[PDB]
Structure 1
Amino acid sequence: GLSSEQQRAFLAVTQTPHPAHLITGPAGTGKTTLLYALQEFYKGRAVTLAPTGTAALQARGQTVHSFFRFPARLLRYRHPEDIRPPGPHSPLRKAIEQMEVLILDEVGMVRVDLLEAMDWALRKTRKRLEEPFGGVKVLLLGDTRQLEPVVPGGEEALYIARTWGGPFFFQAHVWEEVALRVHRLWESQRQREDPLFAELLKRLRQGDPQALETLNRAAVRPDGGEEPGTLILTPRRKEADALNLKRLEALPGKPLEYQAQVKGEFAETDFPTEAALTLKKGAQVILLRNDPLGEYFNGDLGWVEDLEAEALAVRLKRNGRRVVIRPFVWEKIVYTYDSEREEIKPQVVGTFRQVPVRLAWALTVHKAQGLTLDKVHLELGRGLFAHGQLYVALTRVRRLQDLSLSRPIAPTELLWRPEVEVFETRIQEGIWQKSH
């Protein structure tokens, strides 16, 4: 039950021995219906992975980290302390040895070291060190147009620059050894539901600032954040925190504070949520960790239902289920540079223990990537600052009428990294071979 476009991609991927494929498109329904058909074709022979918990959920798969048991830190190139193959008699080894196809959804969000670690882990475990991905056929799916992968400052950023030249999946060295066949999906739900919105988005993908004129005329409405059912997006945390604080204080009900515990060196600017987190019953929240039991994910929206000492209950918007949340621990890692070898080494220097909850009447655009929302209002504040940030903000909703802006978007806020545009122009051909 695929469209003509989807069937062409389906056949191009399944009826060839070629082992490396990229199916790209502004992908929601349509990518997803194709993914499920690929999963049905392959059923036993394919493992589906994704870089984030919410993408893994939508892909009916698991996170890359949870499948390969990678640590939550920089994965140094083919490094035996970071990339460890499974034991001699483990179920993971059996699954990797018997794997025929790896489906990787939302590939645009996969940082280069993660893709390279998948390559090495598959090669080592399968004892096929001369073949990309150990001979596994890889099907990459997703839009090439996203926020850039997270790259912390300091020696980690320098390592990524020195080793790969940048953080994007197409900067992995594995592509120097295998050609990536490219299959485009052009159709989209938005082209049927809001042709104008889709046309504007296409021009903004192409970096045309003139499309901002029509977007601003259609969507600038400063009071749009005061309307019911409207999630507010901000570029920066300070303004989202202020909005969330105002809503929390107006909400009737008794507050309860959750106090984080910090050990060692952990600067407040790195805290993954508030150290003094005040909640009320009915508060709109977002969960900040993936449940190992798969009942909730980082990015799940919900409402507070129960508030108790070191434990709360959240009613999820996604499925209406109740989940019980308790504190999690995040680690602060610093890399020290050796200065006689290349040799940077990670060191955990602090920990932060807190319930994995953040208020969510307002979210950053960065936090909202990967969420599909009903109605959004972009409070621009001091302005958009990152590659793809405007595009991600606009595409959280289905129709242009579901969006409003606090002020006109300026041309300085339409940002695409040039090295990403270069890659895009090169995958127009239908096959791509990385140099060197």
Structure 2
Amino acid sequence: GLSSEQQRAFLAVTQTPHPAHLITGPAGTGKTTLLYALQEFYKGRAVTLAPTGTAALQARGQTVHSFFRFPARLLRYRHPEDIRPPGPHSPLRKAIEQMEVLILDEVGMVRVDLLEAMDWALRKTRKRLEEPFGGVKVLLLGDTRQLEPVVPGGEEALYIARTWGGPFFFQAHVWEEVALRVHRLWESQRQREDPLFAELLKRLRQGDPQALETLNRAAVRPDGGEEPGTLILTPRRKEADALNLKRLEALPGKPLEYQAQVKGEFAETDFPTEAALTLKKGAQVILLRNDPLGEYFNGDLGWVEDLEAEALAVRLKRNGRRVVIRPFVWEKIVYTYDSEREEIKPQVVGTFRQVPVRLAWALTVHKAQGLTLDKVHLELGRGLFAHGQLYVALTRVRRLQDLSLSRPIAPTELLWRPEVEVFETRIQEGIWQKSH
């Protein structure tokens, strides 16, 4: 059963014809758990999406990209080359046409161009350009104090700035057409049996510098990452590799190497996994691509069972089922700027073919947002770089005894986005309306 404030948000969302709602609150307040109640109330009529694979599985839906078949690149505003409606007799078109409610968890990580593309895709497929999201009622859930959207730094960043003025979902132009009603949750549920830890996280969210000093004294334990049953989180992918390789070549099985084929321009900075990736039987892994046959998805955690030339078997954590993994192809897209028409054109400059698997004793903080973890050791590596990164790493566990840091954290390490301050200030009035 839901809590009291969860039930108020349940009724305030399902008892009103209003088409746009946001349920927001600190990490672990029960937003995705109330999302489960919304899925039972709506079940056939609702589609549930999340921006990342891990969040999508945590919300028991799929990624936004996978549902609308969006390409994994910048979705220019209302651009036909990027937002293509489904076929005349496709299962997607009937899904979009029959759909009545769109639930979107972890909306804080949804970049503005992704949200505007959903708006346009729903309008175009339902043949209602007049109405935002094509008449679909959208239920948004997330926290803007958690991880900001991912914005690579090419002309992709300049376009987003020019078109919307920022990468956040609340900067979409559709909010000039609808008022977003805001429901707020406050009471901790993940940390409900450790109120002092919950109070600490509340103060850390407010930016308290003395809260950070109390955390540095209580939680800095360098060897925390070697205690059993501990998931390690890091800011960067390659820092996770160095940590996973330590636990990997400590396993008894025979190692097998999967060598990627790189074509054209594809820097190893952009590799989703290592070009020389070594696995062992029993290694803990996370899957990086969706199965066309639907047996596994991006974000699936599991353990290697068999290793052969270009095919490995993985036992999944999600359902205890055994799936077979084969190499996928990744495209590397860059954006060039025409001076004459003054437009950006995407272009493929390289490919990367490899088994879609990473070792998963250590993960990036981005792959952890939304998870409730039993034990977390945060390895800071070469520092934090994303707004909301530290706060997400700290709030995955239930009790402070389940958390440890590799080194103390300085106040000057902390990132604050001014657009998030402006947003979270106006939302306490209960409404978000983008003017002009």
TM-aligned CA deviation for residue 142 of structure 1: 1.9
Cα distance change on mapping 1:210 and 1:27 into 2, 3 Å: closer
TM-aligned CA deviation for residue 137 of structure 1: 1.4
Cα distance change on mapping 1:240 and 1:38 into 2, 3 Å: closer
Q: Helix, strand or coil for the counterpart of 1:191?
A: coil
Alpha-carbon displacement from aligned partner over 1:149-185 (angstroms, at most 9, x marks no partner)? 1111211111111111111111111001111000011
Counterpart-to-counterpart distance in 2, 1:87 and 1:340: 34
C-alpha contact 1:190 1:197 (8 A) present in aligned 2? no
Alpha-carbon displacement from aligned partner over 1:20-79 (angstroms, at most 9, x marks no partner)? 110112355732332233223323332222222232223232222222221121111000
Cα distance change on mapping 1:253 and 1:90 into 2, 3 Å: closer
1:5 matched residue in structure 2: 5
Cα distance change on mapping 1:390 and 1:341 into 2, 3 Å: same
TM-aligned CA deviation for residue 115 of structure 1: 0.5
Cα distance change on mapping 1:3 and 1:365 into 2, 3 Å: closer
Identity of aligned pairs, percent?
100
C-alpha contact 1:288 1:299 (8 A) present in aligned 2? yes
1:147 matched residue in structure 2: 147
Cα distance change on mapping 1:381 and 1:263 into 2, 3 Å: closer
Matched, 1:204 2:204: yes
TM-aligned CA deviation for residue 191 of structure 1: 4.4
TM-aligned CA deviation for residue 369 of structure 1: 3.0
Cα distance change on mapping 1:27 and 1:231 into 2, 3 Å: closer
**Equivalent residues in 2 for 1:131-142 (5 A)?**
131-142=131-142
TM-aligned CA deviation for residue 243 of structure 1: 2.2
TM-score (norm 1): 0.95
C-alpha contact 1:390 1:413 (8 A) present in aligned 2? no
TM-aligned CA deviation for residue 148 of structure 1: 1.6
Cα distance change on mapping 1:405 and 1:43 into 2, 3 Å: closer
Q: Helix, strand or coil for the counterpart of 1:203?
A: helix
Cα distance change on mapping 1:99 and 1:351 into 2, 3 Å: same
Counterpart-to-counterpart distance in 2, 1:11 and 1:383: 42
Q: Relative to structure 2, which stretch is displaced further, 357-366 or 399-408? A: 357-366
Counterpart-to-counterpart distance in 2, 1:215 and 1:55: 27
C-alpha contact 1:164 1:172 (8 A) present in aligned 2? yes
TM-score (norm 2): 0.95
Cα distance change on mapping 1:413 and 1:193 into 2, 3 Å: farther
2:371 matched residue in structure 1: 371
Cα distance change on mapping 1:89 and 1:11 into 2, 3 Å: same
C-alpha contact 1:51 1:107 (8 A) present in aligned 2? yes
TM-aligned CA deviation for residue 395 of structure 1: 1.7
C-alpha contact 1:299 1:371 (8 A) present in aligned 2? no
Cα distance change on mapping 1:43 and 1:386 into 2, 3 Å: closer
Alpha-carbon displacement from aligned partner over 1:289-309 (angstroms, at most 9, x marks no partner)? 222344333233222211100
C-alpha contact 2:77 2:117 (8 A) present in aligned 1? yes
Counterpart-to-counterpart distance in 1, 2:173 and 2:423: 15
Q: Relative to structure 2, which stretch is displaced further, 12-21 or 225-234? A: 225-234
Cα distance change on mapping 1:184 and 1:327 into 2, 3 Å: same
Counterpart-to-counterpart distance in 1, 2:307 and 2:182: 50
C-alpha contact 1:326 1:356 (8 A) present in aligned 2? yes
TM-aligned CA deviation for residue 411 of structure 1: 0.7
1:30 matched residue in structure 2: 30
Cα distance change on mapping 1:68 and 1:97 into 2, 3 Å: same
C-alpha contact 1:46 1:101 (8 A) present in aligned 2? yes
Alpha-carbon displacement from aligned partner over 1:390-418 (angstroms, at most 9, x marks no partner)? 11111222211101112211112332212
C-alpha contact 2:101 2:139 (8 A) present in aligned 1? yes
Q: Relative to structure 2, which stretch is displaced further, 278-287 or 164-173? A: 278-287
Counterpart-to-counterpart distance in 2, 1:89 and 1:318: 32
Q: Helix, strand or coil for the counterpart of 1:412?
A: helix
TM-aligned CA deviation for residue 218 of structure 1: 1.5
Counterpart-to-counterpart distance in 2, 1:327 and 1:309: 10
Cα distance change on mapping 1:94 and 1:322 into 2, 3 Å: closer
Cα distance change on mapping 1:201 and 1:131 into 2, 3 Å: same
C-alpha contact 2:337 2:343 (8 A) present in aligned 1? yes
Counterpart-to-counterpart distance in 2, 1:97 and 1:363: 38
Counterpart-to-counterpart distance in 2, 1:393 and 1:155: 30
